Amino acid sequence: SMHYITACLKIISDKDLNEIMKEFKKLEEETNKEEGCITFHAYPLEPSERKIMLWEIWENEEAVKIHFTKKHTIDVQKQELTEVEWLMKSNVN
Amino acid sequence: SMHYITACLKIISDKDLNEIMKEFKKLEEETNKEEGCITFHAYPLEPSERKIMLWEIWENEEAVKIHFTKKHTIDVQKQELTEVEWLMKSNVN
């Protein structure tokens, strides 16, 4: 069994998309090292969209919650660069 | 199917109840525009109670989580005006 998540983030920051993506790449690098993370990948939609897409697979639902307690996650969060526009969760076995 | 939530907030701030409610009215206005929000309404109990009641209906549980990632929600949160005293969730179809 695995917990799948696909989410689209709306960028509310006015910073450069490249600068923003660097933060997401660092986050991606650190969260892939989390024990409960099967996969985590972030990438930008077309520049004009000002959106970022997330592909995630976790060992379970708790892994997602644990993820948000990690300092590397909270560090990006404190920057208030985005907010979730839509998200779809699914348990796949 | 819909996700219903009724919550009672305890005001821990010492600010004027009217001032506090204005913040909740702005929040109410913005969250009703969220895609996943069917209804969201906030109102104060009797002044002496120092409590605020919330009536909420969402498309689903994820909509609630998405709600807390929105900047308009976090803005009120950062003010530390309340804490949840009690809350009851229910899925109704």
- Domain borders along chain B are 1-93
Q: Measured between CB atoms, which of A83, A86, A89 is closest to B70? A: A83
List the beta bridge partners of residue B83. B10
Give resolution, Å, one decimal.
Answer: 1.9
**Residue B41, strand partner residues:** B55
CB–CB contact A89 B35 (8 Å): no
In the sheet with A82-92, reading across from the earlier edge strand, the strands are A37-44, A51-58, A2-11, A82-92
Residue B78's closest chain A neighbor by CA?
A78
Architecture of domain A1-93: 2-Layer Sandwich (3.30)
For residue A91, the cross-strand partners are A3
Rounded CA gap, B55 and B33, in Å? Answer: 15
For chain B, say whether A16 makes contact (Cβ under 8 Å): no
CB under 8 Å to A45, separation ≥6 — which residues? A8, A51, A52, A53
CA separation for the pair B46, B17 (Å, rounded):
10
Q: Measure the CA–CA gap between A16 and A27, rounded to whole angstroms.
A: 17
Q: Which residues of A touch B65 (CB under 8 A)?
A: 84, 87
